[PDB]
């Protein structure tokens, strides 16, 4: 779930790309992969499909 | 008459250019107006068929 | 990153939704696994593997 996500830390950008970010608890996930990774700020624009 | 039926109901599975040739997977899947994008697509491709 | 298929495979995540009683024979909505769709279910006599 991602609304027990907003208490630990405040996200300054959530956007969900090809699915819509209030029809995650409405769905079933399937293999989540988690890719993590710290990049410049000036980058984040970069990454996008 | 069997050809042309079995071809007008077989075009029911074609895309058209839209997400998905099922149109309860657009609805249940984008919502807003980028939905309604894709069903655009498929009312213009199962009309002219 | 978030990484999630749709569709692809068995149900195993999911997330904090409500899933109802199943009902026959009637004329009904329903949600397998994310399949949203409308009609009268029954059993069946068939050999799925």
Known sequence: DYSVLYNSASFSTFKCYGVSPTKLNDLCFTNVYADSFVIRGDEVRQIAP | ?49 | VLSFELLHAPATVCGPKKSTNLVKNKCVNFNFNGLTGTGVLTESNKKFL
Do not use: H
């Open chain 2, 1 to 49: 008459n069997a050809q042309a039926l079995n071809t007008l109901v077989k075009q029911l599975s074609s895309n058209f250019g839209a997400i998905s040739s099922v149109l309860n997977d657009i609805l249940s899947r984008l919502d807003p107006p980028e939905a309604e994008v894709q069903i655009d697509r498929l009312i213009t491709g199962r009309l002219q068929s």
